[model samples]
Target chain A: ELIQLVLKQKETISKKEFQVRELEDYIDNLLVRVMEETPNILRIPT
Target chain B: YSYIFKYIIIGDMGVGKSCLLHQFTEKKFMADCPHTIGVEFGTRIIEVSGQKIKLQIWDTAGLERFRAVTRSYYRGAAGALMVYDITRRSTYNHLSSWLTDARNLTNPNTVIILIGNKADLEAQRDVTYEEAKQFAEENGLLFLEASAKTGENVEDAFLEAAKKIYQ
Candidate 1:
């Protein structure tokens, strides 16, 4: 019961660290989705 | 049998935040990085009375306030090292500014320790230990005067916090 508290918090910290990376990947993926799905908006400059 | 304490070290630039982490984890000095790019992490296994605790420390990018990752970095910290340069009164002055963030970001149970670093430069020291000690007393923080250069009280700083967190 005691160290379970510790274990729970450890996962909390790990979750936060993972949260940073996931948001990063999500944003990165979002950019790719935009590039393909909305091709009319993106440009190499005409 | 074992535990790991997450630590966050915060302070003004050039206050030896990384140096303290380097000295504590590797038992050697780390030269300045000009500034930490983002969050820096270091770890070492330490024993307190028979319990072994792996201290996972996070050293901050002093100049990058509220940047990505940092905004939510202190969520589950077991300990926080609030550091300042004793030789530079200006750096010491920023402790309150830094302290406010450390308190606001970290979990309520985080055991904060005030470190007056650069004790080896006592001759050039601008802030008195007594003043810093009183400040820690007022803030309910454990306090120490440490030196990353000579490795003085550097061990005690982290160890004491570990002891508290472990208990």
Candidate 2:
């Protein structure tokens, strides 16, 4: 997969992107924790 | 919480945008507050299906004058609440214009919901549910009417959006 990133003339968006990346990691870690803690929650209740 | 979700409230001036945010976040009535010049945010933590979730709610001024400044906050939004006053036909008419900006600014898959606020004033209603529902269906948005004063459907709207994000 290829990802192409470009920066606008405004520095604020670039900075915001940096902050959003941190959120991305935070979400990834959260998902991992869910997977680890409740491995069976994905199964059907029945 | 496993996820952070950003939701924006946008509508025309004096349409109760901030009140909606105030009601949802504080779970109380705010009789009135000065108009929002740019953007205001409220954060709340919730647990959804056993997952801890953080909701970052952004409130934007609903005026043509605030167009540029408010539009800037659309970046990285996970959800958007496109609000309108049920008593005002013009507010209903502006949904498309707001949607255009929201689509252009937010990432793909950002959830957008159409909210007709001030439903408590049903006697003064100018927009019909059938029409708003059709608009939502055509544009693929989840639609609902809420009375921020009575707290009707307020919790459901926010929680439903969260469930949608999780799915």
Candidate 3:
């Protein structure tokens, strides 16, 4: 009889290191776009 | 109250894309209209199955300005509302182009729905509901004909999309 132990840790995504970077860049670019929304158009009442 | 879904409203130039976002977020008719360079942001909280969920919506301009189009994305939005004017066949014809961009830009699982706007002007309709519904069925999109003016099926479209994401 033989037994082996294996343990590893990963981020939320199947592989987050790369996917994490993807979202990070995406968020950054998106923020830049949102900033361009003029106050006139962004003026929806809270 | 506990979760938020990201969304983008897209369509051709005269399709009233912003009006729908303004209607959904502010619960009022959008008159005159303020334009966005690329995109505008809107947020509203809605309830689905008794769970309060917030939706952060990004409304974007037509395809004329594709330069700023890619920036209006985040990872992949949770949902997309692709709108078209029912009174214009040209608007309906552009759905494929819109879908092509949407599929390329958004998350693989992003829920997309086809919305035919200007439903109030049924007398002048150029795109038939049956044809649009068939398109939705073939593309696996939830579909509706909505009017930003009369507020017909406006909330339901958003709510249904939210439920799809929340599922």
DockQ of each: 0.02, 0.02, 0.07
Query: Candidate 1's residue-wise lDDT over B1-167, tens digit each?
Result: 27778888988888999889888877788565466644447778888878777787876557434544554457678999999999999988888887888878887778999999999997898999899999999989999999988899999999999888864
Per DockQ, the best of the predicted structures is 3
What TM-score does candidate 3 get on C-alpha atoms? 0.77
After the best TM-score superposition of candidate 2, give how far the Cα of residue B47 lies from its true spot, in angstroms.
1.9
Q: What are the per-residue Cα lDDT tens digits for candidate 3 across B1-167?
A: 59879888888887988888878877778665665454557888888888888888876557443453464453448999999999999999999888888888787789999999989998998999999999999999999999988888999999989988874
lDDT, candidate 1, residue B135? 90
TM-score of each: 0.75, 0.74, 0.77
Native contact fraction, candidates in order: 0.00, 0.00, 0.12
The CAPRI quality class of candidate 3 comes to: incorrect
lDDT of 2 by residue, B1-167 (tens): 46889788877887778788778887887767678643457877887888899888876456454333444467668888888889999999998998887788788799888899999999999999999999999999999999888888887788888888883
Q: For candidate 1, write residues A1-46 as lDDT tens digits.
A: 3568788899899999999878665654554455346623322111
TM-score, chain A only, candidate 1, equals: 0.47
Pairs that collide, model 1:
none
Q: What is the lDDT of candidate 3?
A: 0.79
